[PDB]
Every structure is written in C-alpha cells, then in structure tokens.
C-alpha cells in the first residue's frame, strides 16, 4: 500500500555535435506519467499516462518551463564538472539526477531523496534528515560547500515534505484505478531437458503490478541462491511486469525443488512444487 513519486533526469554531452541531450521522466510508483526530451520536435513536457491528461494548460506550461530550466542547469553543470575533474573537451560525459518522496500505506510522508551522479557514480546526495549532504569525493565536497552557503537543503526539504507529497496524493487519487491497484502474479514453472541427465526448471511470474516481487528456489527447503539465474524484472508493455528464475538440476531430482513467490497482491506467498 506504500507509494512513491520520483523524477529522473539525464543529460549527456556530445561535444561537436551540439548541445547536451536532455531527457526527463516522472513516475508514480512503477507507472510513468510525464516526459521531456531535448531532441524532440515538440519542446514540451508531455503526458505519458491517461490520468495526468486532465491537468490544465497552467500545469503543462509550468512544467515545460521548469523542465527546460533543469536542462539549462545541467548544461552548466557539465561545464563545471569538466573543470572540477580537469577533463578534456572531446569526451562525452553523463549527469543524472533523481529526486522525490515516499509515503506509507496511510499516505503520510516516509522518506525524501535528492541525488546526483556524474559518469555513473554517486556525486552528491541529501542525507535522510534532509538537512545535510553526503559528498562522494573531493569535487563533490566543493559542491557541498557551495550548496551549504546557498542553503539549498532547506529549499529542497520544503519541496520533499510539502509539495512532493501533496502532488503524489493528488495523483494517487486522480489515477486511482491504475495506481491503487494490485495485480497478483500468475505463476507457473516450466521443465526442459538440457541433456539426458539434466533439466532446466524455470519459475515464472506474469502480469503483476507493482514491480516489486521475490522469486526463490529451494532444494529440500534450502535456498539455492548461488545456483539460481534470476532475470531483471521486465515490463510486459501493458502496465504489468514479468520475472523468472531458473535452476539446472539433475533429472530425477525435480521433486526436491520448490519455487517460492512473494508479492503484495498475493493473500499468501505461494509455493510451487513438481508433485
């Protein structure tokens, strides 16, 4: 019953092929609802879920202005980071930012977050108290000094505790039917021989929402975690998710192996068996 709203921002320099590419996406839980792409023709923040479409033109015009303003700041940042790390002009670099808030099953604030990465690793992040910063290296300490002098954490806290959770509430209620649903996984296992002495056992979960799920194999009751292949949870394309886990087993021993599925839409965690 727990929820989150998160915004994700990626900017990539392409020196000598123009301005940095900029992409922004917003999600409530695992459902995307807005996007902006610097290279598209529209130059607008655009809807990506039916329930956001009812927002009026002040919403669209405002979010378009704000996201284009985020784009400019990242364009500056790319310059500044090259300087902080004494890096050359002729390599592509990546800045990423994500922020947002979580609320409980009662829709009260749990947690807020605001973090930044450069070239794929942590750069700087607001700590859990929303009053201080974790800086990952010496360059990020320079950002820390500048952000403490500019009282950035206090403006951010006000957003994450107030605004963020107000709008998350609004979205959860406007988007009730799709965001406040739980679709339980439809489960099964497959069996295929890989030779005359071994078989692949694969545990499947289909058509579930939200995306969080655990799938595990046991052999006579003990976890086979180091022998399991577990894929990344993947979108079906229709708003639900899929996941599988597999083990390769000696033929004859199938009935020792069970698959265990935990998901919030199950009344009880399921145990699937070969007998």
């Amino acid at each position: 019953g727990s929820h989150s709203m998160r915004y994700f921002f990626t900017s990539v320099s392409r020196p000598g092929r123009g301005e940095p590419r900029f992409i922004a996406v917003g999600y409530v839980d695992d459902t995307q609802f807005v996007r902006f792409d610097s290279d598209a023709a529209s130059q607008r923040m655009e809807p990506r879920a039916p329930w956001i479409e009812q927002e009026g033109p002040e919403y669209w015009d405002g979010e378009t202005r704000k996201v284009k303003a985020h784009s400019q700041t990242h364009r500056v940042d790319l310059g500044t980071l090259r300087g902080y790390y004494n890096q050359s002009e002729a390599g592509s670099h990546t800045v990423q930012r994500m922020y947002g808030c979580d609320v409980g099953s009662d829709w009260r604030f749990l947690r807020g977050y605001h973090q930044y990465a450069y070239d794929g690793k942590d750069y700087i992040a607001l700590k859990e108290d929303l009053r201080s910063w974790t800086a990952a290296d010496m360059a990020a300490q320079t950002t820390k000094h500048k952000w403490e002098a500019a009282h950035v954490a206090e403006q951010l806290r006000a957003y994450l505790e107030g605004t963020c959770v107000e709008w998350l509430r609004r979205y959860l209620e406007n988007g009730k039917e799709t965001l406040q649903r739980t679709d339980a996984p439809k489960t099964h296992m497959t069996h295929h021989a890989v030779s005359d002495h071994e078989a692949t056992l694969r545990c499947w979960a289909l058509s579930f929402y939200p995306a969080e799920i655990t799938l595990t194999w046991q052999r006579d009751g003990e976890d086979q975690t180091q022998d399991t292949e577990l894929v990344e949870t993947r979108p079906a394309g229709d708003g639900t998710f899929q996941k599988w886990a597999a083990v390769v087993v000696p033929s004859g021993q199938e009935q020792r192996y069970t698959c265990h599925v935990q998901h919030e839409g199950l009344p009880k965690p399921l145990t699937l068996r070969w007998e």
């Binding site: 303003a69 985020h70 940042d77």
Partner: peptide, 9 residues
C-alpha cells in the same frame, strides 16, 4: 510536479 530550478553544481 517537479521542484523549482535546481542550483548548479
């Protein structure tokens, strides 16, 4: 809704 303009690094 997003936050306002982020402060430069």
């Amino acid at each position: 809704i997003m936050d306002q303009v982020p402060f430069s690094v």
